[PDB]
Motif scaffolding. Structure first.
Motif, mmCIF file in Angstrom:
data_model
loop_
_atom_site.group_PDB
_atom_site.id
_atom_site.type_symbol
_atom_site.label_atom_id
_atom_site.label_comp_id
_atom_site.label_asym_id
_atom_site.label_seq_id
_atom_site.Cartn_x
_atom_site.Cartn_y
_atom_site.Cartn_z
ATOM 1 N N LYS A 33 28.633 85.823 11.318
ATOM 2 C CA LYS A 33 29.424 84.651 10.977
ATOM 3 C C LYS A 33 30.751 85.127 10.400
ATOM 4 C CE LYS A 33 30.573 80.410 10.228
ATOM 5 N NZ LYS A 33 29.899 79.667 9.118
ATOM 6 N N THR A 34 31.850 84.493 10.811
ATOM 7 C CA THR A 34 33.174 84.875 10.336
ATOM 8 C C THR A 34 33.826 83.749 9.547
ATOM 9 O OG1 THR A 34 34.416 84.131 12.296
ATOM 10 C CG2 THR A 34 33.485 86.359 12.363
ATOM 11 N N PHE A 35 34.677 84.146 8.609
ATOM 12 C CA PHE A 35 35.384 83.240 7.722
ATOM 13 C C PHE A 35 36.842 83.663 7.686
ATOM 14 C CE2 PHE A 35 31.507 81.503 5.849
ATOM 15 C CZ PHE A 35 30.606 82.515 6.079
ATOM 16 N N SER A 36 37.752 82.701 7.774
ATOM 17 C CA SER A 36 39.154 83.053 7.606
ATOM 18 C C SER A 36 39.956 81.791 7.327
ATOM 19 C CB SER A 36 39.713 83.782 8.840
ATOM 20 O OG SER A 36 39.695 82.950 9.986
ATOM 21 N N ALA A 37 41.016 81.943 6.535
ATOM 22 C CA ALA A 37 41.986 80.861 6.355
ATOM 23 C C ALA A 37 43.314 81.440 5.884
ATOM 24 C CB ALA A 37 41.469 79.819 5.352
ATOM 25 N N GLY A 38 44.393 80.706 6.167
ATOM 26 C CA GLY A 38 45.758 81.168 5.897
ATOM 27 C C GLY A 38 46.480 80.274 4.908
ATOM 28 N N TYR A 39 47.305 80.888 4.054
ATOM 29 C CA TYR A 39 47.957 80.244 2.924
ATOM 30 C C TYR A 39 49.460 80.496 2.994
ATOM 31 C CZ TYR A 39 43.236 79.767 1.139
ATOM 32 O OH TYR A 39 41.908 79.434 1.004
ATOM 33 N N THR A 40 50.259 79.501 2.609
ATOM 34 C CA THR A 40 51.701 79.629 2.842
ATOM 35 C C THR A 40 52.399 80.595 1.878
ATOM 36 O OG1 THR A 40 52.050 77.608 1.549
ATOM 37 C CG2 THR A 40 51.941 77.415 3.964
#
Ligand SMILES: [Mg+2]
Ligand SMILES: [Mg+2]
Length: 155
Positions: A33-40
């Motif tokens: 399972k993979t997790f990722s998110a991007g922040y400004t």
């Protein structure tokens, strides 16, 4: 016996501060399972902490977790700083708030859920899951969709 699980983590940031992202892989029974998110606007070290927080908080029961990262920052905090923090009420020796205390406290809360063995790797060379975490983190930093609401801007 506890379910044994592997977690791999990395952060990526295009500046200091700048757009950034995290990447994590949780592996149980071959299954991944993979997790990722991007922040400004964030920092690399905050993304390193978020990667570990998100993967650990995903677990729905007490596990034995093998946690692998090349972050010297995470290693220094886990092995050198957090024992002082717990004696001093999460303040410095000058009785000042510690940097990134919001994420360090969240990580400590998630860590206390599990039996943790840390695997400090020297780099991404030769560690394919950690390299894939770097790819996940960089991909999110290139498409940021969230604000890092806990980052106290330093500039
Ligand atoms: Mg890193
Ligand atoms: Mg990285």
């Amino acid at each position: 016996m506890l379910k044994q699980v592997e977690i791999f983590t990395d952060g990526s940031c295009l500046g200091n501060p700048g757009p950034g992202g995290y990447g994590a892989i949780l592996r149980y029974r071959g299954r991944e399972k993979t997790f990722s998110a991007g922040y400004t606007r964030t920092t690399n070290n905050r993304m390193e902490l978020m990667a570990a927080i998100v993967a650990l908080e995903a677990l729905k029961e007490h596990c034995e977790v093998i946690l692998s990262t090349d972050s010297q920052y995470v290693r220094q905090g886990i092995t050198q700083w957090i024992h002082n923090w717990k004696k001093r009420g999460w303040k410095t020796a000058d009785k000042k708030p510690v940097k990134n205390v919001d994420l360090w406290q969240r990580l400590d809360a998630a860590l206390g859920q599990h039996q943790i063995k840390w695997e400090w790797v020297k780099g991404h060379a030769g560690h394919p899951e950690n390299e894939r975490c770097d790819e996940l983190a960089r991909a999110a930093a290139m498409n940021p969709t969230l604000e890092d609401t806990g980052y106290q801007v330093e500039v």
